[PDB]
Protein backbone atom coordinates (compact mmCIF):
# COMPACT_ATOMS: atom_id res chain seq x y z
CA UNK A 1 0.00 0.00 0.00
CA UNK A 2 1.57 3.25 -1.16
CA UNK A 3 -1.41 5.60 -1.26
CA UNK A 4 -2.70 4.25 2.05
CA UNK A 5 -6.22 2.81 1.95
CA UNK A 6 -5.42 0.45 4.84
CA UNK A 7 -8.08 0.96 7.49
CA UNK A 8 -7.86 0.84 11.30
CA UNK A 9 -4.38 -0.57 12.00
CA UNK A 10 -4.78 -3.82 10.06
CA UNK A 11 -4.38 -5.16 6.51
CA UNK A 12 -7.94 -4.40 5.39
CA UNK A 13 -8.85 -1.55 3.03
CA UNK A 14 -11.11 1.38 3.85
CA UNK A 15 -13.70 0.65 1.15
CA UNK A 16 -14.17 -2.86 2.55
CA UNK A 17 -14.35 -1.67 6.17
CA UNK A 18 -17.01 0.86 5.16
CA UNK A 19 -19.04 -1.82 3.37
CA UNK A 20 -18.67 -4.30 6.24
CA UNK A 21 -19.75 -1.75 8.84
CA UNK A 22 -22.64 -0.57 6.66
CA UNK A 23 -23.79 -4.12 5.89
CA UNK A 24 -23.67 -5.23 9.53
CA UNK A 25 -24.50 -2.16 11.64
CA UNK A 26 -25.13 0.83 9.30
CA UNK A 27 -22.39 3.00 10.81
CA UNK A 28 -20.10 4.29 8.05
CA UNK A 29 -21.83 7.43 6.80
CA UNK A 30 -22.47 9.10 10.18
CA UNK A 31 -19.14 8.25 11.81
CA UNK A 32 -17.40 5.07 12.91
CA UNK A 33 -18.64 4.62 16.47
CA UNK A 34 -18.71 1.26 18.20
CA UNK A 35 -22.09 -0.47 17.70
CA UNK A 36 -24.29 -1.26 20.71
CA UNK A 37 -23.89 -4.60 22.44
CA UNK A 38 -27.23 -6.05 21.31
CA UNK A 39 -26.29 -5.39 17.67
CA UNK A 40 -22.84 -7.01 17.97
CA UNK A 41 -23.34 -10.78 18.15
CA UNK A 42 -21.33 -13.94 17.51
CA UNK A 43 -21.96 -13.94 13.75
CA UNK A 44 -20.84 -10.31 13.42
CA UNK A 45 -17.84 -8.40 12.08
CA UNK A 46 -16.36 -6.38 14.95
CA UNK A 47 -17.04 -9.24 17.39
CA UNK A 48 -14.28 -11.16 15.60
CA UNK A 49 -12.15 -8.55 13.78
CA UNK A 50 -8.78 -8.83 15.54
CA UNK A 51 -6.02 -6.69 14.03
Amino acid sequence: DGEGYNVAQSNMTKDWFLVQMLANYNIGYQGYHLPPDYKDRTFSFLHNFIP
Partner: peptide
Protein backbone atom coordinates in the same frame (compact mmCIF):
# COMPACT_ATOMS: atom_id res chain seq x y z
CA UNK B 1 3.81 -6.53 8.51
CA UNK B 2 0.15 -6.12 9.47
CA UNK B 3 -2.71 -8.58 9.19
CA UNK B 4 -6.19 -9.23 10.54
CA UNK B 5 -7.84 -12.44 11.74
CA UNK B 6 -11.63 -12.55 11.43
CA UNK B 7 -13.36 -15.78 12.46
CA UNK B 8 -16.92 -17.12 12.27
CA UNK B 9 -17.96 -14.31 9.91
CA UNK B 10 -19.56 -14.33 6.47
CA UNK B 11 -18.29 -11.42 4.39
CA UNK B 12 -21.35 -9.38 3.43
CA UNK B 13 -21.96 -7.41 0.23
CA UNK B 14 -25.57 -6.18 0.41
CA UNK B 15 -27.41 -5.49 -2.83
CA UNK B 16 -28.29 -1.94 -1.79
CA UNK B 17 -27.49 1.35 -3.49
CA UNK B 18 -25.98 2.78 -0.29
CA UNK B 19 -24.93 -0.61 1.17
CA UNK B 20 -27.22 0.13 4.11
CA UNK B 21 -29.74 -2.30 5.59
CA UNK B 22 -32.97 -0.29 5.47
Amino acid sequence: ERKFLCDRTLWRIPFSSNFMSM
